[PDB]
Write an enzyme that holds these catalytic residues in place. Sequence first.
Site, mmCIF file in Angstrom:
data_model
loop_
_atom_site.group_PDB
_atom_site.id
_atom_site.type_symbol
_atom_site.label_atom_id
_atom_site.label_comp_id
_atom_site.label_asym_id
_atom_site.label_seq_id
_atom_site.Cartn_x
_atom_site.Cartn_y
_atom_site.Cartn_z
ATOM 1 N N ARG A 105 -5.726 0.246 5.732
ATOM 2 C CA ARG A 105 -5.094 0.971 4.472
ATOM 3 C C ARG A 105 -4.649 0.060 3.372
ATOM 4 O O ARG A 105 -4.798 0.361 2.270
ATOM 5 C CB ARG A 105 -3.688 1.432 5.245
ATOM 6 C CG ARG A 105 -2.527 0.662 5.659
ATOM 7 C CD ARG A 105 -1.727 1.509 6.342
ATOM 8 N NE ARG A 105 -0.544 0.765 7.322
ATOM 9 C CZ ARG A 105 -0.756 0.188 8.594
ATOM 10 N NH1 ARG A 105 -1.926 0.389 9.264
ATOM 11 N NH2 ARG A 105 0.471 -0.030 8.960
ATOM 12 N N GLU A 144 1.156 -5.429 8.929
ATOM 13 C CA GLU A 144 2.319 -4.940 9.066
ATOM 14 C C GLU A 144 3.243 -5.761 10.507
ATOM 15 O O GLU A 144 2.634 -5.901 11.322
ATOM 16 C CB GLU A 144 2.319 -3.520 9.264
ATOM 17 C CG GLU A 144 3.637 -2.476 9.616
ATOM 18 C CD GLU A 144 4.557 -2.657 8.229
ATOM 19 O OE1 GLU A 144 4.487 -1.732 7.812
ATOM 20 O OE2 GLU A 144 5.229 -3.626 8.128
ATOM 21 N N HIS A 167 1.739 -5.175 3.538
ATOM 22 C CA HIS A 167 2.657 -4.100 3.993
ATOM 23 C C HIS A 167 4.063 -4.482 3.787
ATOM 24 O O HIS A 167 4.509 -5.548 3.430
ATOM 25 C CB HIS A 167 2.237 -3.976 5.410
ATOM 26 C CG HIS A 167 0.955 -3.901 5.837
ATOM 27 N ND1 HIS A 167 0.286 -2.502 6.037
ATOM 28 C CD2 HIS A 167 -0.116 -4.787 6.117
ATOM 29 C CE1 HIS A 167 -0.958 -3.018 6.401
ATOM 30 N NE2 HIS A 167 -1.280 -4.147 6.373
ATOM 31 N N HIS A 192 0.827 -1.209 0.203
ATOM 32 C CA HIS A 192 -0.026 0.172 0.076
ATOM 33 C C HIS A 192 0.785 1.387 0.004
ATOM 34 O O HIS A 192 2.040 1.216 0.413
ATOM 35 C CB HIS A 192 -1.088 -0.109 1.240
ATOM 36 C CG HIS A 192 -0.144 0.136 2.490
ATOM 37 N ND1 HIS A 192 0.200 1.406 3.033
ATOM 38 C CD2 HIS A 192 0.167 -0.765 3.441
ATOM 39 C CE1 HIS A 192 0.860 1.120 4.146
ATOM 40 N NE2 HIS A 192 0.644 -0.283 4.592
#
Lengths: 244, 245
Positions: free
Chosen positions: A61, A88, A183, A10
């Site tokens: 996200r 992440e 991520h 992202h």
Amino acid sequence: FMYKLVLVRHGESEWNKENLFTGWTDVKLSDKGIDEAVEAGLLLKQEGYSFDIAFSSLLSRANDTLNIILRELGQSYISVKKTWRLNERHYGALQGLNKSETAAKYGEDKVLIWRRSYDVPPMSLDESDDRHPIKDPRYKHIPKRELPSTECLKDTVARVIPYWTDEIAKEVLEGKKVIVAAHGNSLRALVKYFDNLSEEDVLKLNIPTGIPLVYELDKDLNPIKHYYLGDESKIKKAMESVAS
Amino acid sequence: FMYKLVLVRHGESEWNKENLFTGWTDVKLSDKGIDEAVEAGLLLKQEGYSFDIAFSSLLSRANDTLNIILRELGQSYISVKKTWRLNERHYGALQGLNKSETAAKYGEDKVLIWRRSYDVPPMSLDESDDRHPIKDPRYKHIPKRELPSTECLKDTVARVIPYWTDEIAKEVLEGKKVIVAAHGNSLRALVKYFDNLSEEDVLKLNIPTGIPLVYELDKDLNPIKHYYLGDESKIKKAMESVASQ
């Protein structure tokens, strides 16, 4: 080759400007982030990519990035699966702080060890801290003992790979075209795995935000090659932004 | 009450202006449609709604509506399941035509029968027609015999309810908060089921686009009541617009 797998990181979030440690903090994409997702989708369309199943994390996200990509492809109807295992890296008690607040609180020495280490995690969150994953109901299906209070990259890799083994690889082996939208560190885990990178090399790997990374794989899922899509200059610009 | 179920119909598509029969045709939302989704999400947030699982069709416009709603709620991470069983009614060979082209091609009599009927489908698509669902790879997991060449509303109801039984109801009974983002006729199927509507009443039911419909359900999933969220005027305006189409 036999199979193609597409990975995408992202774009910019609302915390990248102030350069805050994000980790599992569920921050939104910035408008620049939204635009990076649009361009990643337009790029995939231009190159003829389509998908049968999509994977993402439990963080907004990444999911927003994936949804924007699929919308650009006209494929918002495909099967989507989400997992904490693609989250992440958890940054422990660093989450929400900038680099200077981190130095001041934990000291120059410990911060230098944390940044350079594969296997030494930063200071952990207490379960009483509002930032702790146990307080977020999206994780209530996961035994508390397995929810991280902090992670080193080694921890992140150890919890990503089982999802590759049990879900992502399974779909690839059934002949489905997979995209994974995740991520920086969860994609690092996968790149480390595929290309058998050393601890040193994965620590220096800077995966550009918003540029699809394609792996060509053989019948047994060994990588034949990989490449980022699009122009070398867009990639260089995105790679320097991740470094700086 | 014991449980709440939320249903929402997508907003305007790129074919609503020319008033084309859409059905399974995978048309996009218009910008007005996108905005209706944004408002439906803001409305749900304002009223304190959140969800654990979401269901939609295999059509883009429903899924885009759902994704917009969840984004407005900050819940783009929740489990989403999609099924052909929540698709809009198939309109057979009418798909892509306007009302006057349909009259001219099939005649005034047959068009009048099709509009008023619960159980007489419009003219079916041949398998050789480019519009036939068997040519779209998104349906390849479904036996060809069960992919419709046309549907009457009765056919639509018959293929929606099993999804209610096997998936939606199962989740509600496990205590999950469910949202279903679907289409006019697939939601009509569900409203017919919940409130035991007659064939006549389901044919006159106008579900407004973009306004959440909430069912309160008891322990056994019998409806206690339902209501649309938001201001009476937004609802009236949306209902008149559906009457118009």
